Amino acid sequence: HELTGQQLPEFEMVDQAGYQKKSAEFYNKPMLVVEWASWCPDCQKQLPEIQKVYEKYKGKIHFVMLDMLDSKRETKERADQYISEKDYTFPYYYDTDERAADILHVQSIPTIYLVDKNQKVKKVMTDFHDEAALEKQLEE
């Protein structure tokens, strides 16, 4: 709840090229921050829907910020495989040691943050939303 109706807290992430990315160095598009982990059963059920949301809104609203928890039950190798087996086409990142999740106050995964164009958290969704629900939430 606490973030609903609030500017995004500053956090960082590690992408694939070894880069360390800032949460404020991308803008002009509504943002979809999803905190996920491969071992999680609910993450394995919601991410296929987000994959469908990505291939639709990667030519409309874009910006999928997908952080991943670290580093014991979930590792980078266990991460890159899970993305490859399911064949995922979205850009994902590495929330190093769950630092962004600690900043985002993530107490259950997955957690989806609906961010408007101006980087204001509009809706935090911890329950399951399939594609059409995710398509509708972006519209509303």
From TrEMBL:
Q: Mind giving the lineage of the organism this protein is from?
A: Bacteria, Bacillati, Bacillota, Bacilli, Lactobacillales
Show which residues constitute the signal peptide. Answer: none
Q: Which organism is it from?
A: Streptococcus gordonii (strain Challis / ATCC 35105 / BCRC 15272 / CH1 / DL1 / V288)
Task: Report the protein name in the record.
Answer: Thioredoxin signature protein
**Ranges of residues in domain Thioredoxin:** 2-140
Record key words, sorted: Disulfide bond, Membrane, Transmembrane, Transmembrane helix
Q: Which GO molecular function entries does the Swiss-Prot or TrEMBL record give? A: antioxidant activity; oxidoreductase activity
